[PDB]
Amino acid sequence: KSWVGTWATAPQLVEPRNMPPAPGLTNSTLRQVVCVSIGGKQLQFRFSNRFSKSPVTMKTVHIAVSKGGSEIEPSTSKELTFNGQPDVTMEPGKAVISDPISFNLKPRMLVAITISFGETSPDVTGHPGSRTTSYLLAGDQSSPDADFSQAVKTDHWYVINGIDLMAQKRAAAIAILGNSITDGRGSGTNKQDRWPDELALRLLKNKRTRDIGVLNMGIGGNCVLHGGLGPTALSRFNRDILKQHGVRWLIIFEGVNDIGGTPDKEAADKVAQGLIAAYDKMIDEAHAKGIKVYGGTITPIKKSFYYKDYRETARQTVNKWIRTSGHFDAVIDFDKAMRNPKDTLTLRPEAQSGDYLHPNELGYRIMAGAIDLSLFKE
């Protein structure tokens, strides 16, 4: 057996507007909920301080089955350790991985991770677009019987980075690079129904693909080339994709924010060529590690705040390259799945959030339903 990722979230420097509310993380206890893909029996948990400039101390970390909301099944709670000890300090810019731990992890299990912090970094490493409520209490509230029913709610994740499990060679993971259309803006809070979540459900029910996990490395507002929110896709590619465990496929579905940021035709045409070059660079680097790469066509923007005629031209340039260049190992045509048959330059009205840019839950289900699962064999 060897490690295979079952859940991950892509880290960044948290912006002030997305910081934890009072009472803050220092000397407080934070309960967070994640939804895994594949199950297993022996796990490790990864925590990141990659974007913080001060050390961060976790006095204790516990894991348990979440019962919804902030509640847990207390008989399932276990403590993590880090070289035998319950407490660990992360160095500035670094991550830590727990000791391996036995836990009955079922497919699509909701896992509550409870961290009691000591001193923390005001530049926080986290993932603002969690689409999931986290719960904060002042003090050290690490007992499995602690009451969180009154905790301060925050719809962000902090510090947590991944869960991997030990599996046999038939087990593997898909890693997915994207923006908020992949991170799940428009999906239901606490409903774990981002399109990669909907893909995980389809894989788990298809007997042939039941041991294939899904690692959602979307970042809300992300760019491939420059600017945007969080580190660019090119900058984070090694950490967020190539260093994951057990990955045998990458889906690249990103670039709308690069196009959306352009002020004129000249700039938009340059971004289209830059995206194509960036796709080729990431395809090559993944291929050199034996990973197959599938390309997602960029979905419609007309009627959204991003629409301009010259931006639409760039989008079409990129999509024609995705569809026809042959450089991707296959094409996942999300544009074809999401576009209105009656007005192909706009999203299906009933499958979007009101902004004509982000799908809604139905749209994310349609997008996952358009993926041929035969792309993930062995």
Author numbering: 9 to 386
Paper text:
Acetyl xylan esterases (AcXE) that target mono- or doubly acetylated Xylp are well characterized; however, the previously studied AcXE from Flavobacterium johnsoniae (FjoAcXE) was the first to remove the acetyl group from 2-O-MeGlcpA-3-O-acetyl-substituted Xylp units, yet structural characteristics of these enzymes remain unspecified. All homologs were confirmed to release acetate from 2-O-MeGlcpA-3-O-acetyl-substituted xylan, and the crystal structures point to key structural elements that might serve as defining features of this unclassified carbohydrate esterase family. Enzymes comprised two domains: N-terminal CBM domain and a C-terminal SGNH domain. In FjoAcXE and all studied homologs, the sequence motif around the catalytic serine is Gly-Asn-Ser-Ile (GNSI), which differs from other SGNH hydrolases.
Three crystal structures of AcXE from Prolixibacter bellariivorans (PbeAcXE) were also solved, including a native form (1.35 Å) and two complex structures, one with MeGlcpA-Xylp (to 1.26 Å) and another with acetate (1.13 Å). The sequence identity between the CspAcXE and PbeAcXE is 52.4%. Both comprise an N-terminal CBM-like domain consisting of three antiparallel β-sheets, and a C-terminal SGNH domain where the central β-sheet comprises five parallel β-strands flanked on both sides with α-helices. In both cases, the CBM-like and catalytic SGNH domains are tightly packed and connected through a loop of six to seven amino acids. The residues forming the CBM-like domains in PbeAcXE and CspAcXE are 1–175 and 1–176, respectively, whereas residues forming the SGNH domain in PbeAcXE and CspAcXE are 180–385 and 181–386, respectively. The first seven N-terminal residues of PbeAcXE and the first 10 residues of CspAcXE did not have electron density and so were not included in the final structures. The active site of PbeAcXE and CspAcXE is located at the C-terminal end of the central β-sheet of the SGNH domain, as is common for all α/β/α hydrolases. The Ser-Asp-His catalytic triad is formed by Ser188, Asp363, and His366 in PbeAcXE, and Ser189, Asp363, and His366 in CspAcXE. In PbeAcXE, the oxyanion hole that stabilized the oxyanion intermediate during catalysis is formed by the main chain amides of Ser188 and Gly228, and the amine side group of Asn265. The substrate-binding sites in PbeAcXE and CspAcXE are mainly shaped by five conserved loops, from which two belong to the CBM domain and three to the SGNH domain. As indicated by a structural similarity search against PDB using Dali, the structures of PbeAcXE and CspAcXE are most similar to structures of GDSL hydrolases of unknown specificity and some with esterase/lipase activity, i.e., TesA from E. coli and Pseudomonas aeruginosa.
